[PDB]
Amino acid sequence: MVVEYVEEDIGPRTLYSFEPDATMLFESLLPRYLTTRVYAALLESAASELA
Amino acid sequence: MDPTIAAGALIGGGLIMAGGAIGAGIGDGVAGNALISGVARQPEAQGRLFTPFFITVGLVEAAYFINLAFMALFVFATPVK
């Protein structure tokens, strides 16, 4: 993935709390994100095939 | 003699104030640590955190000032002359 710094959108906003930390959640959530994207691709290709 | 009692009273009052100072100083420090951390997490939590914080301080400084009182009782109205 390419990383895309979007915006600031962080003023008096409250910081999140991560358990156990940030990177463990990130590295256990990334493959789930790729799987979600593959699922969306399969669904879109199915609807397209029916069209 | 009499001065021996006076000296004992001065040393005892000193010890009482020293204990009070250590207790109050470190207690307020360890409470303000949590206060600052909470205000660093959520700014608009400040007005809230001032309720438990000052409760804690109300306890901590209590032990201090009680000692202060007794220190006076040791130094000025020494029980045994």
From Swiss-Prot, chain A:
Subcellular localization(s) per the UniProt record: Cell membrane
Domain of life: Bacteria
Coiled-coil zones: none
Role this protein plays: Produces ATP from ADP in the presence of a proton gradient across the membrane. The gamma chain is believed to be important in regulating ATPase activity and the flow of protons through the CF(0) complex.
Quaternary data: F-type ATPases have 2 components, CF(1) - the catalytic core - and CF(0) - the membrane proton channel. CF(1) has five subunits: alpha(3), beta(3), gamma(1), delta(1), epsilon(1). CF(0) has three main subunits: a, b and c.
Family of this protein: Belongs to the ATPase gamma chain family.
Name of this protein: ATP synthase gamma chain
